[PDB]
Scaffold this motif. Structure first.
Motif, mmCIF file in Angstrom:
data_model
loop_
_atom_site.group_PDB
_atom_site.id
_atom_site.type_symbol
_atom_site.label_atom_id
_atom_site.label_comp_id
_atom_site.label_asym_id
_atom_site.label_seq_id
_atom_site.Cartn_x
_atom_site.Cartn_y
_atom_site.Cartn_z
ATOM 1 N N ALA A 1 6.568 -1.164 8.465
ATOM 2 C CA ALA A 1 5.126 -1.210 8.744
ATOM 3 C C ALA A 1 4.561 0.184 9.047
ATOM 4 O O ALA A 1 5.171 0.956 9.795
ATOM 5 C CB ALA A 1 4.839 -2.163 9.899
ATOM 6 N N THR A 2 3.408 0.504 8.456
ATOM 7 C CA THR A 2 2.719 1.763 8.745
ATOM 8 C C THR A 2 2.064 1.672 10.125
ATOM 9 O O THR A 2 1.433 0.668 10.458
ATOM 10 C CB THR A 2 1.665 2.107 7.674
ATOM 11 O OG1 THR A 2 2.307 2.268 6.405
ATOM 12 C CG2 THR A 2 0.943 3.385 8.011
ATOM 13 N N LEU A 3 2.234 2.726 10.919
ATOM 14 C CA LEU A 3 1.719 2.774 12.286
ATOM 15 C C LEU A 3 0.459 3.632 12.344
ATOM 16 O O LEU A 3 0.535 4.852 12.422
ATOM 17 C CB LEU A 3 2.796 3.311 13.236
ATOM 18 C CG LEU A 3 3.787 2.253 13.737
ATOM 19 C CD1 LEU A 3 5.164 2.832 14.027
ATOM 20 C CD2 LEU A 3 3.226 1.564 14.970
ATOM 21 N N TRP B 1 -5.232 8.659 2.698
ATOM 22 C CA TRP B 1 -5.075 8.084 4.037
ATOM 23 C C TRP B 1 -4.596 6.665 3.938
ATOM 24 O O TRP B 1 -5.383 5.745 3.745
ATOM 25 C CB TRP B 1 -6.394 8.128 4.802
ATOM 26 C CG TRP B 1 -6.748 9.491 5.346
ATOM 27 C CD1 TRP B 1 -6.667 10.716 4.693
ATOM 28 C CD2 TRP B 1 -7.279 9.805 6.678
ATOM 29 N NE1 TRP B 1 -7.088 11.735 5.509
ATOM 30 C CE2 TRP B 1 -7.470 11.255 6.711
ATOM 31 C CE3 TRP B 1 -7.601 9.059 7.801
ATOM 32 C CZ2 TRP B 1 -7.959 11.905 7.831
ATOM 33 C CZ3 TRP B 1 -8.096 9.728 8.928
ATOM 34 C CH2 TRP B 1 -8.269 11.115 8.939
ATOM 35 N N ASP B 2 -3.291 6.489 4.077
ATOM 36 C CA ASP B 2 -2.647 5.191 3.958
ATOM 37 C C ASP B 2 -2.716 4.479 5.306
ATOM 38 O O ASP B 2 -1.882 4.701 6.179
ATOM 39 C CB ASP B 2 -1.196 5.394 3.505
ATOM 40 C CG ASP B 2 -0.439 4.097 3.327
ATOM 41 O OD1 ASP B 2 -1.064 3.098 2.917
ATOM 42 O OD2 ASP B 2 0.790 4.093 3.579
ATOM 43 N N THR B 3 -3.720 3.622 5.462
ATOM 44 C CA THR B 3 -3.972 2.928 6.724
ATOM 45 C C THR B 3 -3.092 1.690 6.917
ATOM 46 O O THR B 3 -2.540 1.135 5.960
ATOM 47 C CB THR B 3 -5.449 2.509 6.852
ATOM 48 O OG1 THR B 3 -5.755 1.490 5.893
ATOM 49 C CG2 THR B 3 -6.363 3.699 6.632
ATOM 50 N N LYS C 1 0.837 -1.201 0.000
ATOM 51 C CA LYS C 1 0.000 0.000 0.000
ATOM 52 C C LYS C 1 0.872 1.251 0.000
ATOM 53 O O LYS C 1 0.837 2.055 -0.934
ATOM 54 C CB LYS C 1 -0.931 0.013 1.220
ATOM 55 C CG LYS C 1 -2.031 -1.035 1.176
ATOM 56 C CD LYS C 1 -2.952 -0.960 2.389
ATOM 57 C CE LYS C 1 -2.331 -1.566 3.638
ATOM 58 N NZ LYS C 1 -2.030 -3.008 3.470
ATOM 59 N N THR C 2 1.661 1.395 1.059
ATOM 60 C CA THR C 2 2.537 2.549 1.217
ATOM 61 C C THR C 2 3.514 2.667 0.045
ATOM 62 O O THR C 2 3.848 3.777 -0.379
ATOM 63 C CB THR C 2 3.326 2.472 2.538
ATOM 64 O OG1 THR C 2 2.439 2.090 3.599
ATOM 65 C CG2 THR C 2 3.959 3.815 2.871
ATOM 66 N N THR C 3 3.959 1.521 -0.473
ATOM 67 C CA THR C 3 4.843 1.486 -1.639
ATOM 68 C C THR C 3 4.127 2.004 -2.886
ATOM 69 O O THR C 3 4.730 2.670 -3.727
ATOM 70 C CB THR C 3 5.356 0.062 -1.921
ATOM 71 O OG1 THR C 3 5.720 -0.577 -0.689
ATOM 72 C CG2 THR C 3 6.561 0.102 -2.854
HETATM 73 MG MG LIG Z 1 1.985 0.673 4.819
#
Ligand SMILES: [Mg+2]
Ligand SMILES: Nc1nc2c(ncn2[C@@H]2O[C@H](COP(=O)(O)OP(=O)(O)NP(=O)(O)O)[C@@H](O)[C@H]2O)c(=O)[nH]1
Ligand SMILES: [Cl-]
Lengths: 202, 1013, 121
Positions: A33-35, A56-58, A15-17
Motif C-alpha cells: 500500500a502507498t503511504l 504524484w502517486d496518491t 496505480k503504483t504498478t
Molecule cells: Mg499505490
C-alpha cells in the motif's frame, strides 16, 4: 517542459504498478500500500521534444490517505483509476472526481479501467459512462499485459502541449562503450533463480 | 531540523511550517519525501486543529492555510460534537470571517482561488452539522450579503453549489437517511428565495459571476421542482442569451442537458411548446454563433482549438439526451420538421468525428432511434435521408471483429495480432446492432450502398486495405437480416466480387488481408452454406489449404473459421450428400494427418474438436462409436506405443515424449469438449492406462524434487510432467461435467480416480500439489456426490486440512488452491452435508475457521463463496431441527458467526460484499427472533429463564460497546432495537446497517436516526 | 541508426536481476536488434520497448560474455553485461532475455556467437 500529474483511485486498482511499469518496465506482483503519496519523474520523448511528468502517486486506502486532496494543489493533469474486476472501485470514481475537480478546476483527466487482462471481468463495457458528461478521456488498460498502457500519457501530452499530432519517437541512441571475483557468485544465483511467468507468450 | 513543527510543548513557528510546505510542493528528491511525512504526521495530530487560527493568520504561504483547513475539515466531519460549545462558535466565526476577508481583498480574491474554494467547502461542512437547527438565518443573511459586493455574491454561488452537491448528490454514503432527509427538506423549504437571487443575477449580466451562478443551477436542476424552470423566463435566457458568449456557453448547454431530463407533466400542451422553443432557440444559436449544419465537425475536433473538443462532446450529449426523450414533439408538426432533421444532421456530422468514446455516445442514440423506427409506425420515412447518411458513416467506420486475426504493423506488413483487441469487442456489437436495424429499415439502399462500394474496389478507384476491410466486416455484420432468397442473390454477387478481387491483387500482404475478409464473410453466413453444398465443400477444402499457408495469421484464422462453420453446419457433414461417394466427415478423417501436418499443437486440437461436433450429430450409436474410433486413430496409436514403453520402464524421462504424451491428452480433452457424453468409449480405451501414467508421472515429480529441491518445480522437464497430470484431470472433469450415465461414472470411473489422485495430492509437498485436483473433485462432488457419500468423506480427509494450511498463513500465496478449495467446500456443503457431520469436533472447528477466513478475503471469488458457505451451513443446521448436533453447533459457533460477520461489515475493508454480509447477519438474527434455536445460547452465567432474544441484545450491546467505545449507550441500544425488529425486511435492514457505518465514522450521532421508516 | 546495418531482428522480453531482493524484474518487451556499425564494424544489441519506444538495452556484444541457461526456461538465456548505456551512465547488469520459442532462443544464440566473431576483428 514539466507537468504535475496526480494519480487517484481506490486501494488496489493498480496505480503504483502502472507507474512502476512506466518507470522501469517491471510488473510488481505484490500489493504494498502507498503511504500518502509518491512523487516520481517520468520523461517521454516525442516529435515535439521531451515532455516531463511529476507523477504524484496518491494513496487509495483511506487509512493511508495522508494529506488527501492537499496533494492535488497546482496539478495540471490527472488520472482517475479503477479496477474492472471490482465494481465498488467504479462506484467510487465520482467521489474521486468530486474531490479532484474541486481543487483542480480545469485540467485534462483520463479515466482508466485497469486489470482487463483478467478473464472474469465485472465492470462491463456498456456500464462505463461517467466520463462523458464530465469530459474525461476513457481507456481500457492492463498494467500486466501492457494493453493501451501508453494511451493515458500520450493523450495528456497532446492536451498539455496543444498538438493533436504528438507521437512518440525513438531516442537516437549513442554508441555504447568498450569496457571479477563476485561476478561468478552473482551469476550462479541468477541462473538458479527461475524467471517469472513462464507460461506467457514472451 | 524540519521536525520542529511536530512539537506541541513549545509554540509553532509559522515560518518553519511554511518552509516545510514549500519544500513538499515545490521541492524534490528526499527533501520532498521527508517534508511530506512531517506534514502528514502534523496533519494527523489530534490536537493539530488548535493551531489552525494561528496558521490562517500569520502564514503567507497559501498552501499552509489550505492544510489548516484540511485539519479543520477532519475535525468538523468527525469530532465536531465532541468539542465544547464555545470552540464550535469560535471556529464558525473565523471561517466565516476568513471568507469575508479574502472576498473584500480583490487581489486575494483573483489569485488565491484554490484557497477560497477550500474555505467555502470547510464552511459547508459546518452547515452539515449546524444548519438550519442552530443557524436559522444563514440563507436570509446570505441573500443580503450578495447585494453589497460582486466578489461576495459570486462566492456565495460557489457555497450554494457545494451545499447542493453535499445534500443531494453525495449524501447516500456520507449521511444517515434521517440526516440526509432533514437537510434535503431544509434546502427545499428555503429554495424559493434562493432561486429569486439566482434569477436576479442572470438578468443583470457574460462574466465570472454569471458562470458561477450557472454552475450552481446545474446542481439545482438535479433535484428542484420543474415549476422553477417552466414558470419563469429562465429557459429563454438559457436557450438564447447565455449561448451567444463562449465562456458561459459550455455551462448553459450542460444545464439545458439536465433540463431535458427534468420530471415534467405529459398532457400539458403549454410545457410541450416551451420544450420545443428552448430547443429551437438553442439550435438557432449554434447555427449563427458557433457553426452551421454543414460544418466539418470531424476536422474541427481533430484540430482541437481551445475547448472545441469539450464543446462538441457536450453538444452531442444535449442533442442525444433531448431527442431521445422529446423527439416525438418534432415528428408531428411540419413547421418543426426542419428543426428535427437539422438536430439530427448535426449528430450525423458529430458521428464522423474520429474519437471512440464520443462515437459510442452517438451510437447509443442511433440504436435508440433505429429501434424506435423499426417499430413505431409511420416514422422511418421521416428519417430516410438521415438513415441513408448513417449507413455510410457506420459502414465506413467498422471496427475489426474478434474473428479477424490480422492487423497492419508500423512497417506496412500484415502480421498476426500480438494480443486480442479486447476494448473493441463491445464496439462491434453496438455497430452491428444499429447496422442490422438500418438494413431492415431499407434493405435495397443497404444492398446498393455495399455492392457499389465493392465495385469501387474491383476497379480499384477506392482500393485500400481499410476500405476493403470495413466493407467486408459490414457485410458480415448484416448476416440474417435479409430473406433467404434476397440473401442468396446478395451473397452470390459479393463472393464472386471478392474472388475476382482476390486473383488480381498479389503478394503475401494483399492475399492476407483479402483471405481474412473472405473468411469472415463466409463464416458469418452459415444459412447460405447449408443450402449450397457444392459451394460449402469447396470452401472447406480451401480452408484446409490455408492450414498450409506459412503466414501464421491466415493459417490460424483458417482453423477458427473451420470450427465456426462446422458449429452451425455440422449436419451437412455427417450425412451422405447427393452425388457424393461418402459422408464428408469420412473424407476429413482419412486425410487428417496431411491437413494438420503444418498446424501447431493447439490448432490441431481445434481441428479434432470440430470433428467431434460433426460426429455427435450421428445418432446411430454404432456409427458414432465407429467414427469416434476412426477419428482417434493417430492419437491412440501414438498412445498405445507409449503405454508399452512407459510400463516397460519408469525411465518418459525424455522431454520429447513428455510433449507427445501431453498432446495425446490435450487432443482427447478437445474431442471430449465437443462430444460430451458421446466420448465415453474413447475414454475407456485409455482410462486405466492413463491413471497408471498419472501414478508414474507423479513419482518422477516427487523424485525430481527430492534430488533437485523445490526449485525443480520450475524446470521445463517437471512442468512438462505436471502438464500431463493437469490435462488428465481436465479430461475427467470435462467428461464428468457432461456425462449422462452417472451409474457408470460412480461404478467405473470414480473409485479408480480417487485412488490415483487424492493420496498423491495429500502426500506431496505444497509446491508440487496441483490446484486442478481440487477443481476435478468439485465437479465430481457436483454431479455424483450424493451417490458416493463415503467417497466424499475420502475427498475431505485427503485435501481439507493440508490445503487449509497452505492458505491460512496469508491472503496471497497459493491463489489457485485458495479459490478452488472454497468451491470444493461449497459444493460439498450443498450436495453432501453428511461428510461434515462425520468430521471430528477438532476438524469441524477448522472448517468453521475456514469459512470466517474466507470472509476476510479481498478476492471476490473467495469472499463470495465464504459468505455463501456460511449461509448454506446455517440452512443445513436449521434443516436438522432440534437435535443434539444442531444445539452443539449453535452453542459453539453462533456467536462466532455473528461477531465475525460484524467485523467485516464495519472495518471498511470489505464493502464489496456488504449485501451478502447483511443477508448472513439477517439470517442469524432471525433465528433468535423466531425462536428457531431450541437451547439457551448463554451458559449459570445469566439468570435462569432469560430468553435468547434478551441475551442476544446483551451480547451485541457489549460487543459493540467495546468494539466502538466512542458511541453512546443509546446509539447502540437504538441501533440494535431497530436492527432486530427489521430482521425480515432486507432492504430496510441494510439501510440500518448503512446508517450504523456512517455513525461510527463520527461522534455523537443521533440515536433517533434509527427510527427512519 | 542511419550509420548501422541490421544483422538480426527477433521479438523478445528482457529482464534484469535485482541483487538486494532476490528476484528477476522486467525491463522491456519489444524488438531486440543486432546493429553492426558500418564505420567501425562493431556490433551491438539495441532493444526498445513497444509503443513508447524507449531503450531497455544498449551494449556491445563483448567477446567475453557467455550465454548461460536459466533453471526455469528452455527458451531463454542469462549473461553478465559490464557497460549498458540504456538508462544513461554505464552500469553492470546481469541480464536475462526470453523469446517466443526454443528455436528463437537457439537462433539468437548462434547469431550472438557470430556477432562476437565479427567484434574480435
Ligand atoms: Mg499505490
Ligand atoms: N492482473 C492484474 N493485476 C494488476 C494489474 N495492475 C496491478 N495489478 C495488481 O493489483 C495489486 C495492487 O496494485 P497497486 O499498484 O498496489 O494498486 P494501488 O492503487 O496503487 N494500491 P494503493 O492506492 O493502496 O497504494 C497488485 O497485486 C498488482 O500486482 C493488471 O493490469 N492486471
Ligand atoms: Cl446443422
Amino acid at each position: 517542459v514539466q507537468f504535475k500529474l496526480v494519480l487517484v483511485g481506490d486501494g488496489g486498482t493498480g496505480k503504483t504498478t502502472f507507474v512502476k511499469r512506466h518507470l522501469t518496465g517491471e510488473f510488481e506482483k505484490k500489493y504494498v500500500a502507498t503511504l500518502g503519496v509518491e512523487v516520481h519523474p517520468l520523461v517521454f520523448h516525442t516529435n515535439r521534444g521531451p515532455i516531463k511528468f511529476n507523477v504524484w502517486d496518491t494513496a487509495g486506502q483511506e487509512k493511508f490517505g495522508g494529506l488527501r486532496d492537499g496533494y492535488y494543489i497546482q496539478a495540471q493533469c490527472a488520472i482517475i483509476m479503477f479496477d474492472v474486476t471490482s465494481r465498488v472501485t467504479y462506484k467510487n470514481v465520482p467521489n474521486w472526481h468530486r474531490d479532484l475537480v474541486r481543487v483542480c478546476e480545469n485540467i485534462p483527466i483520463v479515466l482508466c479501467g485497469n486489470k482487463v487482462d483478467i478473464k472474469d471481468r465485472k465492470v462491463k463495457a456498456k456500464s462505463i459512462v461517467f466520463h462523458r458528461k464530465k469530459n474525461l478521456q476513457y481507456y481500457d488498460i492492463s498494467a500486466k499485459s501492457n494493453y493501451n498502457f501508453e494511451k493515458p500519457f500520450l493523450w495528456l501530452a497532446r492536451k498539455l502541449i496543444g498538438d493533436p499530432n504528438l507521437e512518440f519517437v525513438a531516442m537516437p541512441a549513442l554508441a555504447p562503450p568498450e569496457v571479477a571475483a563476485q561476478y561468478e557468485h552473482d551469476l550462479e544465483v541468477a541462473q538458479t533463480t527461475a524467471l517469472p511467468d513462464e507460461d506467457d507468450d514472451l | 531540523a524540519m521536525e520542529g513543527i511536530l512539537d506541541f510543548s513549545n509554540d509553532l513557528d509559522i515560518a518553519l511550517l511554511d518552509q516545510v510546505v514549500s519544500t513538499f510542493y515545490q521541492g524534490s528528491g528526499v527533501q520532498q519525501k521527508q517534508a511530506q511525512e512531517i506534514l502528514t504526521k502534523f496533519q494527523d495530530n489530534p490536537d493539530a486543529w488548535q493551531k489552525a487560527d494561528q496558521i490562517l493568520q500569520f502564514s503567507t504561504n497559501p498552501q499552509s492555510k489550505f492544510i489548516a483547513l484540511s485539519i479543520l475539515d477532519k475535525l468538523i466531519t468527525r469530532k465536531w460534537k465532541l468539542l465544547p460549545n464555545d470552540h464550535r462558535i469560535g471556529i464558525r466565526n473565523f471561517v466565516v470571517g476568513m471568507i469575508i476577508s479574502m472576498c473584500q481583498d480583490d487581489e486575494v480574491f483573483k489569485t488565491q482561488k484554490n484557497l477560497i474554494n477550500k474555505s467555502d467547502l470547510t464552511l459547508v461542512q459546518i452547515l452539515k452539522q449546524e444548519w438550519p437547527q442552530n443557524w436559522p438565518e444563514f440563507i436570509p443573511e446570505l441573500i443580503g450579503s450578495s447585494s453589497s459586493s460582486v466578489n461576495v455574491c459570486e462566492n456565495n454561488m460557489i457555497v450554494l453549489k457545494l451545499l447542493s452537491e453535499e445534500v443531494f448528490d453525495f449524501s447516500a454514503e456520507q449521511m444517515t437517511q434521517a440526516k440526509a432527509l432533514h437537510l434535503k427538506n431544509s434546502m427545499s423549504k428555503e429554495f424559493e428565495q434562493i432561486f429569486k437571487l439566482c434569477f436576479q443575477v442572470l438578468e443583470q449580466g457574460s462574466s465570472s459571476l454569471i458562470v458561477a451562478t450557472l454552475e450552481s443551477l446545474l446542481r439545482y436542476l438535479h433535484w428542484i421542482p420543474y415549476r422553477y424552470i417552466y414558470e419563469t423566463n429562465i429557459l429563454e435566457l438559457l436557450s438564447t442569451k447565455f449561448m451567444t458568449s463562449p465562456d458561459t456557453r459550455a455551462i448553459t448547454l450542460k444545464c439545458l442537458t439536465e433540463v431535458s431530463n427534468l420530471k415534467i407533466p405529459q398532457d400539458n400542451d403549454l410545457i410541450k411548446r416551451q420544450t420545443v422553443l428552448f430547443f429551437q432557440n438553442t439550435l438557432q444559436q449554434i447555427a449563427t454563433s458557433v457553426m452551421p449544419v454543414t460544418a466539418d465537425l470531424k476536422a474541427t475536433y481533430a484540430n482541437a482549438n481551445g475547448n472545441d473538443q469539450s464543446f462538441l462532446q457536450d453538444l452531442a450529449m444535449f442533442l442525444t439526451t433531448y431527442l431521445a426523450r422529446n423527439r416525438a414533439l418534432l415528428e408531428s408538426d411540419e413547421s418543426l420538421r426542419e428543426l428535427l432533421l437539422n438536430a439530427h444532421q448535426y449528430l450525423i456530422q458529430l458521428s464522423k468525428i474520429e474519437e471512440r468514446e464520443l462515437f459510442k455516445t452517438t451510437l447509443d442514440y442511433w440504436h435508440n432511434l433505429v429501434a424506435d423506427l423499426f417499430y413505431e409506425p409511420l416514422k422511418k420515412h421521416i428519417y430516410e435521408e438521415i438513415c441513408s447518411q448513417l449507413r455510410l458513416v457506420i459502414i465506413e467506420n467498422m471496427v475489426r471483429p474478434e474473428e479477424v486475426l490480422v492487423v497492419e504493423n508500423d512497417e506496412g506488413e500484415i502480421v498476426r495480432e500480438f494480443v486480442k483487441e479486447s476494448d473493441t469487442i463491445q464496439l462491434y456489437k453496438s455497430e452491428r446492432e444499429v447496422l442490422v436495424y438500418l438494413t431492415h429499415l431499407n434493405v435495397i439502399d443497404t444492398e446498393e450502398i455495399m455492392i457499389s462500394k465493392l465495385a469501387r474496389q474491383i476497379d480499384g478507384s477506392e482500393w485500400s486495405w481499410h476500405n476493403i476491410n470495413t466493407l467486408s466486416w459490414a457485410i458480415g455484420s448484416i448476416s440474417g437480416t435479409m430473406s433467404e432468397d434476397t440473401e442468396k442473390r446478395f451473397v452470390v454477387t459479393v463472393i464472386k466480387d471478392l474472388l475476382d478481387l482476390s486473383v488480381k491483387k498479389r503478394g503475401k500482404d494483399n492475399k492476407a488481408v483479402v483471405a481474412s475478409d473472405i473468411m469472415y464473410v463466409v463464416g458469418q453466413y452459415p444459412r447460405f452454406l447449408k443450402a449450397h453444398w457444392n459451394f460449402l465443400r469447396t470452401v472447406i477444402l480451401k480452408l484446409f489449404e490455408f492450414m498450409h499457408e506459412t503466414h501464421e495469421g491466415v493459417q490460424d484464422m483458417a482453423c477458427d473459421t473451420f470450427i465456426k462453420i462446422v458449429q452451425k453446419c455440422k449436419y451437412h457433414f455427417v450425412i451422405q450428400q447427393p452425388r457424393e461417394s461418402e459422408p464428408f466427415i469420412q473424407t476429413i478423417i482419412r486425410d487428417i494427418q496431411k491437413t494438420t501436418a503444418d498446424l501447431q499443437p493447439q490448432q490441431v486440437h481445434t481441428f479434432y474438436k470440430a470433428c467431434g461436433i460433426i460426429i455427435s450429430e450421428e445418432r446411430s450409436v454404432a456409427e458414432r462409436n465407429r467414427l469416434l474410433s476412426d477419428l482417434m486413430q493417430l492419437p491412440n496409436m501414438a498412445w498405445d506405443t507409449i503405454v508399452e514403453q512407459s510400463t516397460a520402464n519408469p525411465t518418459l524421462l525424455d522431454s520429447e515424449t513428455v510433449k507427445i504424451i501431453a498432446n495425446i491428452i490435450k487432443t482427447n480433452v478437445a474431442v471430449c469438449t465437443s462430444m460430451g457424453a458421446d466420448f465415453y468409449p474413447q475414454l475407456g480405451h485409455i482410462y486405466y492406462n492413463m491413471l497408471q501414467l498419472y501414478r508414474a508421472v507423479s513419482s518422477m515429480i516427487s523424485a525430481q524434487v527430492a534430488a533437485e529441491g523445490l526449485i525443480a518445480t520450475k524446470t521445463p522437464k517437471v512442468r512438462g510432467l505436471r502438464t500431463i497430470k493437469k490435462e488428465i484431470l481436465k479430461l475427467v472433469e470435462t467428461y464428468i461435467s457432461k456425462a449422462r450415465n452417472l451409474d457408470d461414472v460412480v461404478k467405473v470411473l470414480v473409485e479408480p480416480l480417487l485412488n490415483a489422485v487424492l493420496e498423491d495430492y495429500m502426500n506431496n509437498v505444497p509446491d508440487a500439489r496441483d490446484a486442478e485436483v481440487l477443481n476435478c473433485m468439485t465437479t465430481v462432488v457436483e454431479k455424483v456426490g450424493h451417490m458416493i457419500p463415503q467417497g466424499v468423506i475420502l475427498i475431505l480427509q485427503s485435501v481439507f486440512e493440508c490445503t487449509l494450511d497452505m492458505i491460512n498463513k496469508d491472503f496471497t500465496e497459493y491463489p489457485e488452491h485458495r479459490v478452488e478449495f472454497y468451491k470444493l467446500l461449497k459444493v460439498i456443503n450443498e450436495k453432501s452435508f453428511a461428510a461434515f457431520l462425520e468430521l471430528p469436533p477438532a476438524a469441524f472447528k477448522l472448517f468453521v475457521d475456514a469459512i470466517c477466513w474466507a470472509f476476510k478475503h479481498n478476492n471476490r471469488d473467495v469472499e463470495v463463496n465464504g459468505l455463501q458457505i456460511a449461509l448454506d451451513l446455517v440452512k443445513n443446521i436449521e434443516r436438522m431441527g432440534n437435535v443434539p448436533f444442531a444445539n452443539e453447533f449453535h452453542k459453539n459457533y453462533f456467536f462466532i458467526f455473528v461477531s465475525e460477520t460484524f467485523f467485516v461489515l464495519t472495518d471498511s475493508d470489505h464493502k464489496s460484499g456488504f449485501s451478502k454480509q447483511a443477508l448472513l447477519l439477517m439470517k442469524l438474527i432471525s433465528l433468535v427472533y423466531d425462536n428457531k434455536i431450541s437451547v439457551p445460547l448463554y451458559q449459570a452465567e445469566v439468570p435462569q429463564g432469560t430468553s435468547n432474544q434478551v441475551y442476544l441484545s446483551q451480547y451485541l450491546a457489549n460487543m459493540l460497546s467495546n468494539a466502538f467505545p466512542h458511541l453512546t449507550s443509546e446509539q447502540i441500544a437504538s441501533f440494535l432495537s431497530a436492527l432486530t425488529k427489521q430482521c425480515k425486511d432486507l432492504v430496510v435492514f441494510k439501510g440500518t446497517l448503512r446508517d450504523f457505518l456512517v455513525q461510527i465514522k463520527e461522534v455523537g450521532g443521533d440515536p433517533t436516526d434509527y427510527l427512519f421508516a | 541508426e542511419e550509420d548501422e546495418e541490421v544483422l538480426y531482428k527477433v521479438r523478445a522480453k528482457l529482464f534484469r536481476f535485482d541483487k538486494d531482493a532476490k528476484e528477476w524484474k522486467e525491463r522491456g518487451t519489444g524488438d531486440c536488434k543486432f546493429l553492426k556499425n558500418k564505420k567501425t564494424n562493431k556490433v551491438r544489441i539495441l532493444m526498445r520497448r513497444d509503443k513508447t519506444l524507449k531503450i531497455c538495452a544498449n551494449h556491445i556484444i563483448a567477446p567475453e560474455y557467455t550465454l548461460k541457461p536459466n533453471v526455469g526456461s528452455d527458451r531463454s538465456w542469462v549473461y553478465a553485461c559490464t557497460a549498458d548505456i540504456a538508462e544513461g551512465e554505464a552500469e553492470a547488469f546481469t541480464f536475462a532475455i526470453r523469446f517466443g520459442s526454443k528455436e528463437n532462443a537457439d537462433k539468437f544464440k548462434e547469431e550472438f556467437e557470430k556477432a562476437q566473431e565479427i567484434n574480435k576483428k
